[PDB]
Amino acid sequence: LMPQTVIDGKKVSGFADLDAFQQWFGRPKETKKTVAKLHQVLRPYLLRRLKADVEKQMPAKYEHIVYCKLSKRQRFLYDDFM
Amino acid sequence: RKETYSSYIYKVLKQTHPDTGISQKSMSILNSFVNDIFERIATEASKLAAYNKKSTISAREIQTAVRLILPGELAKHAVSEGTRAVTKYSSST
Amino acid sequence: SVVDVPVPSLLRGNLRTYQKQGLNWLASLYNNHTNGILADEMGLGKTIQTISLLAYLACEKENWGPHLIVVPTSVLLNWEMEFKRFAPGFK
Amino acid sequence: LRDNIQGITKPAIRRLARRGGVKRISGLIYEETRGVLKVFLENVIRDAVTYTEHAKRKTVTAMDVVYALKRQGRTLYGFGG
Amino acid sequence: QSRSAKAGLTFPVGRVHRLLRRGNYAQRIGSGAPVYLTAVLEYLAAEILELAGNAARDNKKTRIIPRHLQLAIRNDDELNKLLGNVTIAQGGVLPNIHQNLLPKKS
Amino acid sequence: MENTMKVYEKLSKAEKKRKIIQERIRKHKEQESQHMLTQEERLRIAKETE
Amino acid sequence: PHRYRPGTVALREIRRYQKSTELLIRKLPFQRLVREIAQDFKTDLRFQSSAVMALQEASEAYLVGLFEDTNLCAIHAKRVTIMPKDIQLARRIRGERA
Ligand SMILES: Nc1ncnc2c1ncn2[C@@H]1O[C@H](COP(=O)(O)OP(=O)(O)O)[C@@H](O)[C@H]1O
Ligand code: BEF
Ligand SMILES: [Mg+2]
């Protein structure tokens, strides 16, 4: 979004050094406050919206988990491989 | 540490033609042919010296090696220029 | 703050309210001369909002200049289709 | 290991001949060209390998290739040596 | 003062002497041999470079590239005779088409 | 010396043909630059494309 | 539909490829070939890219020289297509085959 740019033969930096960014945010309950500060930083650049708030037409989403037994051949190959 | 003829090649080229440049590929090719011709002349002079049983290579050895290696017209002008250079150096004493 | 910029006349179909809000926010970034990241929980109409932004650039700013969009291969044709659908005036 | 000599594509030979200015090529040329090429490479690489053995180094170098070519009576410029 | 200057030679006559001595080509080297060799090498370089530059200018280019250098060397019969066994990387080949291959009737 | 003569002649003929075609293309460029597009006609073209 | 006559594209590409300088044989297949050959000569010999590139240059030069010689030879037989006999004859007269 804000890269280093050359103007009139000179370089101008648009954004903080990656190392400084890592030092401030990446190094650290404090994680919640750091994430909140990150969100604050994004606030100019980022517009975030969620389906449930935006619309209520088709909320119906369902997730199911299926358990599968290994076939004798598959079981054998798995055991052998390990 | 190493050494190369590239500097002198650039110098002489500029003296012939200030506006023209050389890439490393061409520069290395030039260095290589200069090296090859130098080895050729030196080995010919070594042979001619050993054949006449002389231990000291000389202006004569190089003269005759250049006579042999270079084509006759190119040889004639090369020897002419070499003679001029040698005589001017000797006169510098 | 963000200004409720006029709806582009070139708009085909109905921008939903939230899509209008997103349009206005993009136009605000343009007026601020600032680049932006736009992340919607997928399936909200990012692409129609892109159309609406370009159309706002079209009506008010007259700037149909040669804009560039770089995109995965699969969605590319769908993008072409949606350009036809939402604003067929774009070459 | 499998067959690399066939791997040199027919278009490669065709374009090489194209540089040679030949109008048309009989199909049999491809096998003969491959044989000639392989023989040449065999000789050159043999010389390069023995040179590398003499150096005692495990890696062959451009210098070894230059010396191998020179021994064959072929001179290459630009790669040094 | 450098011996090159006293001779008036661009190439490093001293380095040439060093190479000839170290190069074990001969037991002894007369002081006239390095100056003669140096002058010869300088002359040859002068011609080849002149030809390369002329070729480059022909292309309307200004940096000598192996294409131009190859053209230069092969254009001169006697330089070809010297370099008849020399291959130039990226040298390419001369334009050569046989008259019998040209399209249509004469 | 003959190579230098050949290249010099080539350069001179190149220069003359160059300047002639330069005049031609400059006339074409100046005659093309005159064109301009108004918003209204741009819009109508848009409608046609619509 | 328009279609060039046999040999028109021939000459066209002759010109084109004669002009160009770029190396003609595909790099990776050549590298595989040379690696195999070296493995035949001695196992586990490492090759850096510069060495294979130089060898590929040399190979191209040798091949193109042979092609030139064979092209000159073939037309002497009044033909315009080279045949294997031209390859073996040229190679033998070169003193490579014998
Ligand atoms: N106002 C609208 N009327 C009808 N369909 C719409 C409207 N806005 C968006 N859509 C549908 O929403 C879909 C979202 O597609 P797309 O924008 O590519 O996904 P995302 O919003 O995740 O980027 C589109 O295919 C479009 O058909
Ligand atoms: F963000 Be989407 F669904 F392309
Ligand atoms: Mg999307």
From TrEMBL, chain D:
<feature type="domain" description="TATA box binding protein associated factor (TAF) histone-like fold">
    <location>
        <begin position="6"/>
        <end position="71"/>
    </location>
</feature>
<keyword id="KW-0539">Nucleus</keyword>
<comment type="subunit">
    <text>The nucleosome is a histone octamer containing two molecules each of H2A, H2B, H3 and H4 assembled in one H3-H4 heterotetramer and two H2A-H2B heterodimers. The octamer wraps approximately 147 bp of DNA.</text>
</comment>
<keyword id="KW-0597">Phosphoprotein</keyword>
<comment type="similarity">
    <text>Belongs to the histone H4 family.</text>
</comment>
<dbReference type="GO" id="GO:0046982">
    <property type="term" value="F:protein heterodimerization activity"/>
</dbReference>
<keyword id="KW-0488">Methylation</keyword>
<comment type="function">
    <text>Core component of nucleosome. Nucleosomes wrap and compact DNA into chromatin, limiting DNA accessibility to the cellular machineries which require DNA as a template. Histones thereby play a central role in transcription regulation, DNA repair, DNA replication and chromosomal stability. DNA accessibility is regulated via a complex set of post-translational modifications of histones, also called histone code, and nucleosome remodeling.</text>
</comment>
<dbReference type="GO" id="GO:0006325">
    <property type="term" value="P:chromatin organization"/>
</dbReference>
<keyword id="KW-0007">Acetylation</keyword>
<keyword id="KW-0238">DNA-binding</keyword>
<keyword id="KW-0544">Nucleosome core</keyword>
<dbReference type="GO" id="GO:0005634">
    <property type="term" value="C:nucleus"/>
</dbReference>
<keyword id="KW-0158">Chromosome</keyword>
<protein>
    <recommendedName>
        <fullName>Histone H4</fullName>
    </recommendedName>
</protein>
<dbReference type="GO" id="GO:0003677">
    <property type="term" value="F:DNA binding"/>
</dbReference>
<dbReference type="GO" id="GO:0030527">
    <property type="term" value="F:structural constituent of chromatin"/>
</dbReference>
<dbReference type="GO" id="GO:0000786">
    <property type="term" value="C:nucleosome"/>
</dbReference>
